[PDB]
Design a protein around this ligand. Structure first.
Ligand code: ATP
Ligand code: ATP
Lengths: 95, 299, 216, 300, 217
């Protein structure tokens, strides 16, 4: 679509960059978290019920979430190095 | 059975002719009996409070819907092929995304989740008999041999510390309990023996005039049994004062856990057991202080 | 019924209290055995009660020899022996009425006849106003008679006494000597021991001496 | 005047030498009654040497806005520890502080498109004990909320007041046991000595009804009570040393699961002589009370 | 200079041991007060020691007044009282030698003269051989004589005797009565109070009487 394809790709790149931004907020919450986990030997690793198991469930939840971030990178990276390469090749061939 | 009541009506004026001495002897028996009573009530209180508390170590099992959907519900059927586990409650699929967006605070960025690869944990805990050492590690091969899972983790080691700290506390308590019991036995066996040893002349005159073997022991076994009875009764009516002393203090500990805790008092049968034990130990210590003392005056 | 063969009493200190003593008395007569201070008169009365073993020798009582008897029936012998002692051995923790009434409670008499017997025993010795009292505030003349009143209850067959009338005046010493001679018309063996001679020289039953166990 | 002291001491030991199945029994009762405060005091000293393993109770993590590199974050950290409530803060930051994530927590680095790491460290702040608790927590929140640019104002006190209420419960239960323990020490001697004097009441009687002195009667009984207390405290020290040698093996199992070189540290020499002196004074006071009670009995 | 004006003692049981006694005593004077077994024989000695204070009247001893005396002063006026007792007031669980030696320990005597004082006392009483055994293994009659031996140590100024020759024979009674007869050559009074009248019928001394409480003499 010539310039309209580039205009749509700009909005797609903006949405992708916002997904990147949400990804380092996920890693910031993960850090903020991993260090909650922070504790050399003491009392915090016992406490009482519920909330300690909730923290372990949160970090094990992030253990699957951050590797799911890898394939959510890869899913939009499949259309990043191929659609944009074809859009530049189609515009150069028509010109 | 009242033919000779002279013994029971005779072993009271020895305890009433010196009322301050008998009173403060019953004081020391009650004080030395209060420590094992309060220690036993503390032991039974923390034993009752170790039932709904002191949680079992947690085993985390992954049973996600990426592999299969009906197998995640059906794996409950073959996870009973292993003894020791009594709680097999499994959280539903809404719990995983209902807890993450309500406590982690990052539920606003997961609105565009087209596929959800997030698994669920399993609440599988063993009973109290098979706990500690490598008993948790002996059941690894059977859990790893269970199909329908992708991976499993060993995510706890704090329970080994907890059942080393409680083992040390139990060792200290078991060392101190029999030592307090020995303190009670020795304070009965000494606190009455000097009472018979105070009145040697009654033994000498009652033996020197022609009596029988039991008539010498008649006003002394009852005196020792009554002294132990008075000490045990005073200990029971003094331990409840300290129970109501700590009754207000344990209340603030209840609401910081969200529950409500109460004090388990001494029951009727164990109070009668304490009275009978103290009376028989007083009787034995009065017999052993007199039939040994009867052989002195027969050369 | 007292009969003595050649017995020898020796303590753990190696001192011969009685080397050789031999006497025999019919059942139902008095005696007035005396001696010096070093004589063993009170321990001679003690061997009859069986509180002190005769060591080497044979002693007869009634028809049974108290030489190798077990301790289970040692104190069954002294229930029929009305011995008063050197020091007045009393129960200071209880009153004089329960002090006198010890052998009636021992023998198992009914409680209605205990008071009558104790009052009859205290009539002849003269202790009525000082009944239901303790022996602490009784003076030694009264405490010596308390043991006498304890030894004259429930009509003993054999009666022993080592120096009564010691803390007692001469006017009442004669009266308690006729109290002993008031028991000795019913059959009772009396073995009165004493040290004074003036109030026992007016009579003669078995007036015998003791010099380190020797008799004649 | 030392001759009468020597005579009183020799009379006290002449009584204590006689009846060796009675003096030893009284010493054993006093020693078993006194070996409870020794054992609970070793436990009380044992749990106060778990104060280096107890717990930093606030874990406040305050971090400024993004790209807070070099001395810009260090000045904020230095003024964060400039308050009166916080005095020690270790300043770990940048990439080497970030390296604990990849080897400790594992996870995925995602270094292909992470480029610049957005958050090097947060605060690492350890204040001093728990006098800054929830009664005074909102007071110190107002100190740190004045400066802007902080997205890390969160305080989730996961300990809450729990291990507090529990510590107050333990410190109250131990106190109301220990006052009874001290009174049990104060009363077992108080009747062992008193009944020993009551056995020898006739001696006080016959010494009063001859020519005597008011202070002569006291001294053998006082020395007998002092030797009873001294023997009880000495055998209590012996029993407590055997129990320390018994419990030396029991700390070895909890040493492995913590990986620390820990000693029980029982029976220090500065407190043993103090225990002996206090128990000797209790025996002296009990003998004084019993002898004064029996001296006022025989008044005209 | 020991004298009684009109004194008497009441009791917690309501019985009157004395009804008013008036007697005077020079230093170094014998006495042979006697009576029945109900009169105030031993009680009068208990008043004159200071063991029992009178309920009525006031009492003077030596040169001072000893009625209503303080408890801190009554042991200081008992060292010079050599009281013999009726019952054997003796230190049980103690040997004979230190039992006689206790008044020397009260007097503060040294460790060298105490043996030659106590052994001389037990020699003059006649109980030297029984100096290493206990009173529980002594004879009953010679448990009194160690009481006399305890009463005749350290030279008491006033010697009181609550019935000796009680458990003593005929021949030894004049032997122990003649022990007090060289005490009259020095300034010490003796208050012999016996029941039998045979040992006083051959002696001419002061003859006091007690009868129900009335003394006069
Ligand atoms: N328990 C004893 N242990 C050792 N020797 C004893 C004992 N009792 C008495 N004796 C000795 O026995 C002898 C006389 O004792 P016993 O009791 O018969 O005297 P007694 O005749 O009552 O005395 P007295 O005539 O002076 O009143 C003495 O040598 C005395 O030392
Ligand atoms: N503390 C006391 N309380 C009450 N009554 C007492 C007390 N002491 C003695 N009595 C009584 O008062 C009287 C005084 O007797 P006391 O002591 O003078 O001896 P006694 O009659 O001469 O006798 P003994 O023959 O023993 O010498 C007696 O009746 C005695 O029981």
């Amino acid at each position: 679509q010539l310039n309209k394809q580039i205009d749509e790709m700009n909005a797609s790149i903006a949405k992708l960059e916002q997904q990147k931004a949400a990804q380092e907020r996920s890693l910031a919450a993960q850090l903020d978290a991993a260090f909650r986990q922070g504790e050399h030997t003491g009392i915090q690793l016992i406490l009482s019920g519920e909330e300690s198991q909730r923290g372990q469930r949160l970090q094990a939840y992030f253990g699957y979430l951050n590797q799911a971030r890898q394939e959510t990178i890869a899913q939009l990276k499949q259309t990043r190095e191929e659609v944009a390469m074809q859009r530049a090749e189609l515009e150069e061939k028509q010109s | 059975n009242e033919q000779v009541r002279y013994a029971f009506h005779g072993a009271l004026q020895d305890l009433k002719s010196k009322p301050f001495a008998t009173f403060l002897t019953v004081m020391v028996i009650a004080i030395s009996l209060t420590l094992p009573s309060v220690c036993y009530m503390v032991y039974k209180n923390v034993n009752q409070a170790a039932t709904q508390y002191y949680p079992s170590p947690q085993i985390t099992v992954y049973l996600q819907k990426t592999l299969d959907d009906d197998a995640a519900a059906g794996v409950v059927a073959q996870l009973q092929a292993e003894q020791g586990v009594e709680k097999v409650n499994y959280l539903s699929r809404e719990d995983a995304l209902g807890e993450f967006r309500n406590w982690s605070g990052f539920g606003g960025a997961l609105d565009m989740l087209e596929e959800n690869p997030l698994p669920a944990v399993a609440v599988v805990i063993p009973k109290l008999d098979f706990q500690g050492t490598e008993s948790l590690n002996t059941l690894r091969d059977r859990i790893t041999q269970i199909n329908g899972i992708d991976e499993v983790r060993m995510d706890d080691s704090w329970f080994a510390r907890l059942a080393a700290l409680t083992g040390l506390v139990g060792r200290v308590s078991a060392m101190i309990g029999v030592l307090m019991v020995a303190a009670v036995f020795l304070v009965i066996g000494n606190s009455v023996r000097l009472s018979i040893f105070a009145r040697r002349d009654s033994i000498n005159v009652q033996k020197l005039i022609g009596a029988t073997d039991g008539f010498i022991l008649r006003p002394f076994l009852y005196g020792g049994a009554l002294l132990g009875f008075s000490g045990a009764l005073l200990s029971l009516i003094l331990s409840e004062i300290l129970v109501l002393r700590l009754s207000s203090a344990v209340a603030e500990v209840a609401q910081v856990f969200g529950t409500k805790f109460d004090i388990n008092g001494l029951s009727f049968d164990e109070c009668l057991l304490l009275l009978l034990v103290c009376s028989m130990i007083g009787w034995v210590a009065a017999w052993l202080a007199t039939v040994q003392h009867l052989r002195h005056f027969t050369p | 019924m007292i009969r003595f063969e050649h017995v020898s009493k020796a303590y753990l200190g190696g001192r011969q209290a009685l080397q050789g003593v031999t006497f025999h008395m019919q059942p139902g007569e008095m005696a007035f055995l005396t001696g010096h201070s070093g004589a063993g008169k009170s321990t001679l009365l003690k061997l009859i009660c069986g509180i002190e073993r005769p060591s080497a020798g044979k002693i007869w009582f009634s028809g049974h020899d108290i030489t190798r008897l077990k301790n289970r029936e040692v104190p069954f012998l002294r229930r029929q022996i009305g011995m008063i002692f050197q020091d007045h051995h009393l129960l200071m923790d209880r009153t004089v009425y329960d002090n006198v009434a010890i052998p009636l409670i021992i023998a198992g008499a009914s409680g209605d006849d205990i008071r009558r017997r104790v009052s009859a025993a205290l009539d002849k010795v003269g202790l009525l106003d000082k009944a239901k009292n303790f022996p602490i505030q009784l003076s030694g003349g009264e405490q010596q008679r308390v043991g006498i009143a304890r030894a004259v209850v429930n009509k003993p067959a054999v009666l022993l006494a080592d120096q009564p009338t010691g803390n007692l005046d001469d006017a009442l010493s004669e009266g308690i000597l006729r109290l002993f001679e008031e028991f000795n018309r019913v059959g009772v063996t009396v073995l009165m021991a004493t040290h004074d001679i003036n109030l026992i020289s007016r009579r003669s039953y078995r007036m015998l001496t003791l010099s380190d166990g020797h008799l004649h």
